[PDB]
RNA sequence: GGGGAUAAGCUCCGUGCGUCGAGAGGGAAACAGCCCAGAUCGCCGGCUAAGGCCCCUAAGCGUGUGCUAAGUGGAAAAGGAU
RNA sequence: AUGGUUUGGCACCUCGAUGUCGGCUCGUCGCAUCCUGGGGCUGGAGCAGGUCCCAAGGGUUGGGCUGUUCGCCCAUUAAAGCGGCACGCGAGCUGGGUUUAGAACGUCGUGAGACAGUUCGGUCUCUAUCCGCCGCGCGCGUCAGAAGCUUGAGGAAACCUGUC
RNA sequence: ACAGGAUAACCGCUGAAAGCAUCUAAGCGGGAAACCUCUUCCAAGACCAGGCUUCUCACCCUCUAGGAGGGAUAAGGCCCCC
């Protein structure tokens, strides 16, 4: 559970512009 | 071709920074700049040219906020369950020079050269240092205005 | 303070109390000890006294070692050890050249005797760390004594430094605590320490007043 | 604030010495020392009183004002009048007798308990089941009076133990 | 001392305060005394 | 939008939508599919994009006015709260 | 809403092989605490409890039945904790179970045969290269070459407890 | 083990913001097998490679005389031997 939430969170980074592959 | 330091081109000088009442982060970045020789215009990444930096009054150094009791300095011995931590307040009481050293050590390059730079940093807890024969030049932390 | 004197283990024996109870004592020769040097705070950084013990032919002693004895003004001794005290108020009790004897102790005073254990050589895990074994029947294939599993698998995937396995054992310094001294023999300079002190018959030991009961 | 906006009256027999943010008061009962916070400036009116002032109106100055003023009045009152805390003990076979500067309590324990008086505090026993503790520092007087109060666990059923005179302790009934 | 995510002034004498960043409720009746945690 | 529990890095569809597939270089610490941008070769020249400018780490412990006391920043819900 | 240990959903790594249940030996970690330690509130008189908060240093038994995990039972005990580590651990051990070929019963099938039905029997291979770990040496360094005796930054071990 | 230090839960003292009240914002205290010392052991390859002492503390050759190379030694050590 811990691993999944962290990956979806790091899509919010400034350089990703709110989208990332594999969500 | 751009100029690169030869055999005997490098030169050293000794700086002493009064760590009293200086912020730990601010003092460390100033020392880490000196030790790497960033101030000289003869800088070259693969050749060290930093100037020996002596830090005196290393136990009076001021740490802001609640970091005196809530910031831990961790260390692991390798054995299972071997992780032992000391809050900064305790680490200052036992041996105070460590807090200044680590906060500088983690500012320098981590490669083999950064291990050689460390040999040029002498830090003392008291207000006196034995290196008076080398005539350290007193150094202060200002900021060039733009 | 922490009285101490360098001694030699002689052997074990058996003596009887006034209440007719039997006590198994170890005979320790606490031979005369010569104070060769005193370590002070301003000189060395700790407060300790350096004793010497044993008789050695002066031809045998090596020249660097011989000079240390001559400078202190004493005859060379086989073993030189050092007792660590804890203050300058205790160092003042000692002076170079003063001789210590078995009389410093009294009957009924708890002491801690330190020595090098007996040698046991390459010892298996059934002997070293007191493992169990595996059954000698019901099918055990050639595993009657070997340890067994070492760790997990693939997590951690290493052996976790600190695990207990085979290797050399014994022959290491060890200290026994709160050993009563049954009798202080005056003529022969021998302590009758009730209990079993570590070492091998004729091995050097250090007997000091107990930390806990002292 | 309202507390901080009230000048501190100094009776004629009391001496007040001010050194910036450091304050010391000398009087008949003894000498006390105090230090005030950075935001507040402490000065002396020529009438012979104490006045405290706060420069701005944020939390720090407003909160520190009331404290800093009422800290001095306790300081001045300690060196003219002093503080005496009166206690009394309830229970059967509960005794108090004074030994030197120390105080002993017989609270029903298998052993008797002894309390040592620190510097600046004195114990004066009046009756076996009633005594008093007197000193200069209001905090130190109240502090030791707290420790004495913790000697016996609260007893809602019979009320055995130490008490303050005006204290009213809740009591329930142990029936079944 | 009840420890709940929700603390309320059960009775009229109950007072809601804050000590060391944690909300409490202090009342003369010890039953009402609770703390947010 | 359907199926699912309006779950899945699920599955099935539409899109003169994109990229990877078949794509190097800069950014996201590392990280095919996200953001900037399509590599003809050389240069010890210059200006920029996304992203940054205390030290590692290149360039700001930048200027003005405020806010935060929680290391919030540097994970989260019903709800509680002078 | 947390957790990811249960029954599942998906089919993304491995079918030119990732050995699968129990037991043994060996551990190590979390705290959502069984005992021991500290507290609040009690419809807490005392003894004994109930509930909640802090706390992971140590400890946590021997047997009957079953392949059993689990469970019931017999004696104690201060307690007989819950879970992760490929439902830890088979290049460490057993093979009782399951899941090859033999055989029989019940049931299905006209028949070869079949049964997450039952019963008896049924090969557990390998000289450790590298990381790892337990031990022991050879070389060099510490600004001349050697010998004693040491401070110790940094680690490791231990920490249980009852009755009178 | 005994003892000491800083603490968790919890109990407090002095106290304003907020004429009262509040363990809290400034201060001061108590407080557990947990943490740091205390007990035992390893430990200067701790590259900041440590300290107190003691002994030897001096002889030749070569290239070219700058440094290096070669030999014989002292204190000491090792090998062979019991
Ligand atoms: C005596 C000498 C034999 O040792 C055995 O009997 C071991 C004990 C078998 O285990 C027997 C015994 C047993 C119980 O397994 C231990 C049983 O499971 C099966 C029948 O294998 C082996 C290793 C089998 O492997 C196993 O094959 C399985 C299909 C997969 C399994 N694992 C990788 C997935 C793997 O170990 C396999 C295929 O025969 C290996 C092949 C190459 C051989 O024929 C080799 C040359 C054999 O002559 C032999 C090794 O010399």
Interior angle at CA B104, CA B99 and CA B110, nearest 5: 125
Name residues whose C-beta falls within 8 Å of residue B116's C-beta, 6 or more positions apart in sequence: B48
DSSP string, chain B: ------SS------EEEE-TT-BHHHHHHHHHHHHTT-SSTT-BTTB-----EEEE-TTS-B--TTHHHH-EEEEE-SSTT-EEEEEHHHHHHH-THHHHHHHHHTTS--SHHHHHHGGGEEE-SSS--SGGGG-PEEE-------
Interior angle at CA C183, CA C179 and CA C186, nearest 5: 130
- Protein CA at A1 to nucleotide C1' at G5, angstroms: 14
In this structure, are residues C115 and C26 in contact, taking their beta carbons and an 8 Å threshold? no
Rounded distance, CA C131 to CA C165, Å? 10
- Protein CA at C48 to nucleotide C1' at G146, angstroms: 26
Rounded distance, CA D61 to CA C8, Å? 75
Rounded distance, CA D43 to CA D32, Å? 18
3-state secondary structure of C65: helix
What resolution in angstroms does the PDB record give? 3.6
The answer to whether residue B81 neighbours chain C at the CB level (below 8 Å) is no
Q: Is the CB of A17 under 7 A from strand F?
A: yes
Spell out which residues of B between 23 and 82 contact strand G, using CB within 7 Å.
75-82
What experimental approach yielded this model? cryo-EM
Give the bridge partners for C99, in sequence order. C34
Phi and psi at residue B68, in whole multiples of 5°?
Answer: -70, -25
Spell out which residues of D between 157 and 176 contact strand G, using CB within 7 Å.
157, 172, 174-176
Cα-to-centroid distance, B112 and ligand 1 (Å)? 51
Nearest to C101, CA basis, from C15, C200, C185, C193: C185
Rounded distance, CA B6 to CA B51, Å? 18
Cα-to-centroid distance, C139 and ligand 1 (Å)? 20
> Shortest Cα distance from C162 to chain B (angstroms)?
6
Neighbours of D150 (CB within 10 A): 10
In this structure, are residues C41 and C204 in contact, taking their beta carbons and an 8 Å threshold? no
Q: Which nucleotide is nearest to B95 (CA to C1')?
A: G153
Rounded distance, CA D13 to CA D81, Å? 11
Name residues whose C-beta falls within 8 Å of residue B75's C-beta, 6 or more positions apart in sequence: B83, B84, B85
Interface of C with B in 138-167 (CB under 8 A): 160-162
In this structure, are residues B27 and B18 in contact, taking their beta carbons and an 8 Å threshold? no
Cα-to-centroid distance, C144 and ligand 1 (Å)? 24
What b/e string do you get for C186-214 counting C-beta neighbours within 10 Å, with b at 16 or more?
eeebbbbbbbebbbeeeebbbbbbbeeee
Which of C157, C161, C163 would you mutate first to test chain B, the one with the most B CBs within 10 A?
C161
DSSP string, chain D: -TTTTS-B---TT-EEEEETTEEEEEETTEEEEEE--SS-EEEEETTTEEEEE-SS-SHHHHHHHHHHHHHHHHHHHHTTT-EEEEEEEESTT-EEEEETTEEEEE-SSSS-EEE---TTEEEEEEETTEEEEEES-HHHHHHHHHHHHTSS---TTT--EEEESS----------
DSSP string, E17-33: EEETTEEEEE-SSGGG-
Domain of B83 in residue numbering reads as 1-146
Is the four-CA dihedral C61, C67, C73, C79 of positive or negative sign? negative
Neighbours of D66 (CB within 10 A): 17
- Number of domain units in chain B: 1
Neighbours of C52 (CB within 10 A): 25
Contacts of C160 in chain B (CB under 8 A): 80
Give the bridge partners for C173, in sequence order. C116
């Amino acid at each position: 559970a811990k691993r999944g939430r962290k990956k979806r969170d790091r899509k919010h980074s400034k350089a990703n512009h709110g989208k990332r592959p594999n969500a | 071709p751009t100029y690169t330091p030869k055999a005997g081109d490098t030169t050293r000088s000794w700086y002493v920074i009064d760590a009293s009442d200086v912020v730990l982060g601010r003092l460390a970045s100033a020392a880490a700049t000196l030790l790497r020789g960033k101030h000289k215009p003869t800088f070259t990444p693969n050749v060290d040219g930093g100037d020996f930096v002596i830090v005196i009054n290393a136990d009076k150094i001021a740490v802001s906020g609640d970091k005196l009791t809530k910031k831990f300095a961790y260390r692991h011995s390798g054995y299972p369950g071997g992780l032992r931590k000391r809050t900064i307040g305790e680490l200052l009481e036992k041996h105070p020079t460590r807090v200044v050293e680590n906060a500088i050590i983690g500012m320098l390059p981590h490669n083999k050269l950064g291990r050689q730079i460390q040999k040029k940093l002498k830090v003392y807890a008291g207000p006196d240092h034995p290196h008076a024969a080398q005539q350290p030049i007193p150094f202060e932390i200002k900021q060039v205005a733009q | 303070a922490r009285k101490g004197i360098l001694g030699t283990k002689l052997g074990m024996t058996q003596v009887f109390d006034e209440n007719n109870k039997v006590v198994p004592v170890t005979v320790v020769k606490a031979g005369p000890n010569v104070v060769t040097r005193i370590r002070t705070t301003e000189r060395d950084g700790y407060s300790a006294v350096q004793l010497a013990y044993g008789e050695i032919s002066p031809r045998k002693v090596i020249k660097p070692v011989a000079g240390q004895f001559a400078a202190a003004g004493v005859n060379p001794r086989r073993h030189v050890a050092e007792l660590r005290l804890d203050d300058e108020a205790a160092v003042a009790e000692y002076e170079v050249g003063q001789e210590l004897t078995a009389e410093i102790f009294s009957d009924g005073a708890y002491v801690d005797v330190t020595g090098t254990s007996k040698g046991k050589g390459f010892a298996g895990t059934m002997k070293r760390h007191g493992f169990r074994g595996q059954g000698a029947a019901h099918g055990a294939q050639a595993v009657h004594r070997r340890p067994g599993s070492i760790g997990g698998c693939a997590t951690p995937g290493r052996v976790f430094k600190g695990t207990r396995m085979s290797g050399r054992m014994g022959n290491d310094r060890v200290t026994t605590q709160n050993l009563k001294v049954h009798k202080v023999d005056a003529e022969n300079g021998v302590l009758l320490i009730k209990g079993a002190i570590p070492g091998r018959n004729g091995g050097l030991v250090v007997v000091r007043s107990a930390i806990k009961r002292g | 604030s309202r507390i901080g906006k009230q000048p501190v009256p100094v009776p004629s027999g009391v001496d007040v010495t001010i050194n910036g943010q450091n304050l010391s008061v000398k009087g008949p009962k003894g000498t006390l020392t105090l230090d005030v916070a950075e935001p507040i400036s402490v000065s002396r009116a020529e009438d012979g009183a104490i006045v405290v002032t706060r420069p701005d109106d944020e939390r720090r100055s407003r909160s520190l004002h009331g404290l800093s003023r009422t800290l001095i009045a306790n300081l001045v009152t300690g060196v003219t009048e002093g503080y005496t805390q009166k206690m009394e003990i309830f229970g059967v076979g509960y005794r108090v007798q004074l030994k030197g500067q120390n105080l002993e309590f017989a609270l029903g324990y298998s052993h008797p308990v002894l309390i040592e008086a620190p510097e600046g505090i004195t114990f004066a026993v009046e009756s076996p089941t009633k005594f008093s503790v007197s000193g200069i520092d209001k905090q130190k007087v109240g502090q030791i009076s707290a420790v004495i109060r913790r000697l016996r666990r609260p007893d809602p059923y019979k009320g055995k133990g130490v008490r303050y005179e005006g204290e009213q302790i809740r009591r329930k009934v142990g029936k079944t | 001392m009840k420890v709940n995510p929700s603390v309320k002034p059960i009775c009229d004498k109950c007072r809601v305060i804050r000590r060391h960043g944690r909300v409490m409720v202090i009342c003369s009746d010890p039953r009402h005394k609770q703390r947010q945690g």
